[PDB]
Amino acid sequence: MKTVIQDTADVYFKRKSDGKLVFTAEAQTASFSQAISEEKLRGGIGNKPLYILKSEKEINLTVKNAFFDLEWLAMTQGESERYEVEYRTISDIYIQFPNVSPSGEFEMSLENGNALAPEIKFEALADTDTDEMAVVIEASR
Amino acid sequence: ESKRYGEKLKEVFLMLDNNVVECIKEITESSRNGKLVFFVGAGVSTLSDYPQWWRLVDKYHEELYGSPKKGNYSSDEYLRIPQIFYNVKGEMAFDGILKDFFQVDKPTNPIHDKILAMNPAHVITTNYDNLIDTACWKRGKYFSVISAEEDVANATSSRYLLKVAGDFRKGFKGENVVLKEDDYLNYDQNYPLISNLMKTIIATHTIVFIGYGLGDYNINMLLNWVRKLQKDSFHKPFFIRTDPSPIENETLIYYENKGLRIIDAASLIDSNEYDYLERYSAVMDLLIESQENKFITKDDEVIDYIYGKISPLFALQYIRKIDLKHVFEYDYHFEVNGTVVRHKNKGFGYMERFFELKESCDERSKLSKKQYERFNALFNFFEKNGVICMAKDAGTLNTSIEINSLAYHGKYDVMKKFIEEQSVSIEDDYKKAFFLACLGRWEESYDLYSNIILNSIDESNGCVYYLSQINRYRIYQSITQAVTQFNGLGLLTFGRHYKPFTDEFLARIEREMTNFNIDDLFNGMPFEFQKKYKILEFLSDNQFLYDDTVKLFELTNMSSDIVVLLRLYDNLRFLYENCLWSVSFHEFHQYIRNSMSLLIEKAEYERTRGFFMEYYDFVNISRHFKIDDIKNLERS
Amino acid sequence: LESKRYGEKLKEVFLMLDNNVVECIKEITESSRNGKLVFFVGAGVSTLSDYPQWWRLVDKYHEELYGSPKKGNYSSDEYLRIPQIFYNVKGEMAFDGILKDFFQVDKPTNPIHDKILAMNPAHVITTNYDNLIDTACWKRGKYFSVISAEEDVANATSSRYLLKVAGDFRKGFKGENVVLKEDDYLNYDQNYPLISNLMKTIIATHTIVFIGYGLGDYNINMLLNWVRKLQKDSFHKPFFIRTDPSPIENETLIYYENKGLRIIDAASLIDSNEYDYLERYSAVMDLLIESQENKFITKDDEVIDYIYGKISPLFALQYIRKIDLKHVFEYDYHFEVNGTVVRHKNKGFGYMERFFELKESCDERSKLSKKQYERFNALFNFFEKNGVICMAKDAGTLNTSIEINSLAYHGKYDVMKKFIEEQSVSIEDDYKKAFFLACLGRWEESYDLYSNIILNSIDESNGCVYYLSQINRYRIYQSITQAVTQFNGLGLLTFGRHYKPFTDEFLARIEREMTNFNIDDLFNGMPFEFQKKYKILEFLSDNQFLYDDTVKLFELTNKVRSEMSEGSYSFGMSSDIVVLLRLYDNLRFLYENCLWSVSFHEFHQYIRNSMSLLIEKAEYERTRDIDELGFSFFGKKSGFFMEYYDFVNISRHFKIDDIKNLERS
């Protein structure tokens, strides 16, 4: 007799300047893509005396079942920005991504919004000075 | 038998007078439209060996007097003898004989099935046996039975089985049926509802009178009621007469001026004096086989069964070939490559003979002008729809797609210029709204669709009105799903949430579009639109043109690649030439992505154990796909 | 604000009703939802559009004949007597010359027309000469076939009529096309024999609601007389919306409620002046409109009964799916595969949330009626047996179990034979016996058993054993014929005997019986109750069988492959676990309900393609690669271990060829 076991995670997306909770949703998928690019970046000998390791790192995140904070919605509705994300998945890890960028696209469904497409995508934005992509914290099991 | 009967029916069809041919043509059309109602009487039940009424009158007579009558009973003696018995002997004795005679179980003759083979909307019988109810139940055609006054209001279904002369369902008693003289003398006072329910079906339906004599009480009462109407005011009922001797001409003229359109059974065939089962069968099989197009053999006749199904599909600019096997019946499957194959015809092939008229010049020249100008339109339309000649005569097989939609190529300036210029020919307005949908001005598209819906009901064009309503519903969905996200993800994606729609406009659309379901739109259109444009039904439901994705399942596990690409281009041409807003929603994008990804994956797979793309493939990949999907296909 | 206050004011009026005007609302709403609601719009609904009342016409005729206008109101007979004198004295070309001036005017449609064409009436019987109702139907996307003359009855273009029992001015503003001066009321049955029959049939086969028509009218009196001629109870009682200024005297109400009418009074529902007719109409019409949306639903017993009103019919079925349950609630709650429930958007009170909260606390379940308690004791069992756990927000670690309690799924052919040889008790036993027989070959016996099942359910009102028994027979028919045509070109001498288990006479019997069936029409041929009370059991008899499951299965497979190549991680439910849950749902449903359709190519392909994806994902998960920080991201999951059900499914609907290639690839 099969029994499927499924866990869940809570994703907390907020602003940088204050503790204003932008919204809270679930976790659907995460993609850490570290690799290199075409030969156009580095061709012939060039910097042979000092070989430099190039590491292209991308952090994509998807969240589903997202509801926006009422206070933040009221503040923003009545009349660039850098945000952050926090993870509290289960032990239980506390992953925090700072300076993320929310991408997105609008889709229209025939059945008046079948599944309502509540998928929000985030991309990890890295600056020349800032370096901490994710803070991993472990707690009691 | 097997061959003799089939040849005899087709031979008798060629000797029938024009009157019988017209009667059969009208009956078949009424049955196909769904407005055919049979009127079964005593005679379709006695074929199942059910007792006749005179055999009970004789029992009453010999229980009253003592000997059977020396002759045949008249019309008065049918109602007066059982009434004398009821008055004198009593009521329980009157019901004992009814229980003795009618408490029998009999089979169902084939006629009872043939009556159900024509799909009658209703069935009105004047007998008390449950043979027709049993046949309807066993064949799977549910009919609500109405044999009592209390049954009229409590009708579960929409099709009736009105038994206007009582029934023995509640018990074998004389209080449930009409048998005596005073029962007929008080029929309009004891049965006030079943009289209206019978007089309404007669006036709003096609009526046939199988199983009746030409001098019955019911027929004369119906004709007396009919003579009280105005000039024509209704369709004259048909009357299948199956008596042994041929009908005299004087009595035919007398009855054909009272309303009946008699189709005598003992004139199309010659049969014995007691072969009643082979006289019902002649007319019934003639009608049924006339439905199946077996009795169709001529050059001008194939330009009627071909024009009469293609002519409604002229407002549309390009209809798919996948569903073109639906405008014609399921026979003659149409393939994407352009090959035709008969599957379930069971009659004279018309398309196969149709191709011959386009493969010569003398055979075509032998057609009448009215039937020849029709053939020219049919031929040019067929070429325009990529339906080139029969499978057997296969030749140079080429496939080209020439989507001329001004929005597929993304010529936005041309769309703006077309919108600016004042438009007439309301179809031209129907394009503009779609262009207004492409540019994003959804409020103007909604207004122009409402204007088209207002000025289209008065016209005789239902296709434009139906498509405009569907497009307006889709635009309303798009507006609602955009407003639900601007007050939402829009703050993060853009910030300073745009309000491109006035709140009053949203309230107006919510007041108009509400209380309107999309599943019943096609069911509210007229009967002609529900039959001429049945192929347009899939647009109404949310599972629109989903007859292709399952083969994606089947073709994933002329090859599959070419057919899949051809269907993709067919759907694109259909949804873009005929301006439909449902080409920008997630379902169609998912279908396009799935088809193109399957084709690319199969090309890579066949490259191991290649494919050449073009402008229409590049546009589809760049439009219906996303960056993530393209990255996936490049890396996989 | 008008809308701000009116919504709550209607609720205040509703809770203040006498409950005698609540059964009328219940019946009217039920008729509107069942498509058997017909309105009888009178001559008082058009007056809201400032249409000329008839008394202003009799006054105009009376001015022509008797000098100055009359001093006082006109009785119920002078209305039909003054114009008749004008016609018989002044003439006929002058009779229409006044009708043209008093009726050749275009007026706007009042909101009551929208209220009437908001309940979707089956037909609209009216006694007006204007075109306001037709115009309202025109500008709202509803096509009503108009009937204003005897020659229009036969030429009904559509099925929903707009019968006008008084006439119309479409043919021209002449008095010969309308019901008018007393002679027209005498030679009516002789002049309009078809329209009267149509009206008296729609009245006797529908639920009629009267709007307008102040009591004492001529037409209402004639209808009351005709209903008096009816027998005892064959006719229903027509409702009657009374919107006069003053309340109704109790004696008059008692007098008129014993003749057939069920008067819904408007003056006894709100406070209004002598000339507040629009508000009086709109109060009743708005109560009727807002009662069908479940806006007036407060109590707990209402919620439990309403939920029982969509689950009680589904008791003959042994296990209904979860995606199909969304249709049972008119698209209000997305029942998910894991058992969680969500809100589509809504229409009224959140009855699902209230039901879940009632099930959470025993005290709240004890704070309700007794009969509703018995209903709850069955709803709880049905929901637990069908894998529904909680609301979406209150989810958690769900140990979703699956069970296929059927001998067919577990082999055990000797037990099947033992059951088959035994006698039968009830029709549900014959159904399972026929399914077991079909699983054991012997299709000649199975077809006859299905025919006997269909014949033996005549008046039991159990469509599940009737709708399915036919369908299974169709699937026990095709599999016969499809088997017959495959043993001639492939099984010609494969066994050296040309074994054709079916004879030649039986195949001619099934052809005669299973002719012109048209299975796609069967659902539309069932009674009106079965078409809505069992609307879920419709995807069996169509091309939708496993159709949209495959439509979503392609998306799931593509997502699984993308996440397989992106090197991405999954949280909660994935694109692979959902496939397993959906496949097990369908597999349990088909077998537990004993549907023969579980032995066709479509299902054998769907299960194959689902389990291939599951095996792909499991094998990929067995060899995952460590990442920079993803090494501590995907941990304990291990959600795919091939169990007994997977093994039995991986060897029955499964092909030797793919296992030959999928074992090494």
Ligand SMILES: NC(=O)c1ccc[n+]([C@@H]2O[C@H](COP(=O)([O-])OP(=O)(O)OC[C@H]3O[C@@H](n4cnc5c(N)ncnc54)[C@H](O)[C@@H]3O)[C@@H](O)[C@H]2O)c1
């Ligand atoms: N009227 C009497 O008192 C009487 C006396 C003795 C015998 N009969 C016989 O009873 C039969 C019916 O007499 P009727 O007065 O009702 O004429 P009828 O024409 O009014 O009978 C009604 C219809 O029954 C149909 N039908 C189908 N099978 C039939 C069958 N085997 N026999 C008769 N009709 C069949 C016929 O189309 C007939 O038109 C006749 O065969 C007659 O010889 C009648």
Ligand SMILES: NC(=O)c1ccc[n+]([C@@H]2O[C@H](COP(=O)([O-])OP(=O)(O)OC[C@H]3O[C@@H](n4cnc5c(N)ncnc54)[C@H](O)[C@@H]3O)[C@@H](O)[C@H]2O)c1
């Ligand atoms: N009866 C006469 O001879 C006469 C003479 C002069 C004036 N009137 C006026 O005619 C009006 C109605 O009397 P009636 O005899 O014609 O029929 P009625 O009052 O007996 O019944 C007509 C029904 O239509 C509705 N109705 C009446 N006036 C309406 C209005 N302005 N707006 C919306 N609905 C309205 C009401 O629901 C009424 O029950 C009265 O207000 C009266 O002032 C009548």
